[PDB]
Ligand binder design. Structure first.
Ligand SMILES: O=c1[nH]cnc2c1ncn2[C@@H]1O[C@H](COP(=O)(O)O)[C@@H](O)[C@H]1O
Ligand SMILES: O=c1[nH]cnc2c1ncn2[C@@H]1O[C@H](COP(=O)(O)O)[C@@H](O)[C@H]1O
Lengths: 184, 187
């Protein structure tokens, strides 16, 4: 599809759907010998709002396909604004994130929950800007790698806009300037 | 169709839901053709009522994009209080922005007894939004405890305990692709 504010398309929703199916395939095998079951010992997807909402709805669906018992958790940051509802102490957790850049965020999340003692703590990210860490972090599961660029859609946003896009696209440079200043 | 041993009968498949959401999304598109909805300035604000609307929402918002409907996505989390019969729930997460002078759309998984949905509505009505409406995937008309009509309805249903595509039984089965009826031999 083509857009007005996109400098170029990155990941079409078809390619995306494909990369997700695949990763959930890897996830599925990796916890095979883990005695995961509904109710008692399911895979706890701790998803981070609001940028992984799309990723999480599609990926959790990728996992039912591989018959993977899962628990949905939603937490928010901006600061901790919404924490987990139920405990992850003695559970396998999957911190679902949208994109790792500086990693300053996921590192914080990881340890916090790491000090929460789950049976194991792993991370899936939809998009990963490997070339920009301000600090070391390695996602366990990665759908796609992207260069240091501002991308929107598939849940991803600029000022809480362009999230509902079906595709991952690049925000035209002369569009964020064009608004960032109208802002700041 | 897929198998669901824990399910006695599938109600709706992903594709049926798809067809119904898309349909609903165009209807939302004509109804707002004239309110000059625009990004940043005056989008369609989607108030997703966690945890159940998460799947509906991800899908809903895309169909709407297809119809060029600029949507602002908001997510709210709530918790029962008991203590309550008015529909009173505790706010764990509120919207990032105000809805004042805004075209707002509450997004529920299922309207049933409607106490919560009716309660949030009243909550948000008092925040002076440009307009306030609701879309619900599922609706169990009879089951009211309070009079409540939704502005959009993906599909109607009888009083079954349903599950899937967001909807849960004791935090279970929401990850499912289709909406199915939890079989009696499981409660
Ligand atoms: O290109 C981007 N598009 C959308 N959000 C981004 C982008 N880069 C960073 N972010 C947001 O920045 C948050 C923190 O990134 P990090 O802490 O540097 O890994 C992410 O969860 C994203 O929501
Ligand atoms: O048929 C159902 N299956 C699963 N959960 C349901 C069903 N009906 C209501 N719920 C849950 O209970 C909430 C209450 O809806 P209410 O009865 O209209 O207030 C819903 O949002 C769901 O989380």
């Amino acid at each position: 599809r083509e857009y007005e504010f996109a400098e170029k398309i990155l990941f079409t929703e078809e390619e995306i759907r494909t990369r997700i199916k695949e990763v959930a395939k890897r996830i599925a095998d990796d916890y095979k010998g883990k005695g995961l079951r509904p109710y008692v010992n399911p895979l706890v997807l701790i998803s981070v709002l609001k940028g992984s909402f799309m990723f999480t709805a599609d990926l959790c669906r990728a996992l039912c396909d591989f018959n993977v018992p899962v628990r949905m958790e939603f937490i928010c940051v901006s600061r901790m604004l919404l924490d987990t509802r139920h405990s992850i102490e003695g559970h396998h957790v999957l911190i679902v994130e949208d994109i790792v850049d500086t990693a300053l965020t996921l590192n914080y999340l990881y340890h916090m929950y790491f000090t929460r003692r789950p049976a194991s703590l792993k991370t899936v990210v939809l998009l990963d800007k490997r070339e920009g860490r301000r600090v070391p972090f390695s996602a366990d599961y990665v759908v796609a790698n992207i260069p240091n660029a501002f991308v929107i859609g598939y849940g991803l946003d600029y000022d809480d806009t362009y999230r509902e896009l079906r595709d991952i696209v690049v925000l035209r440079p002369e569009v964020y300037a064009e608004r960032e200043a109208a802002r700041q």
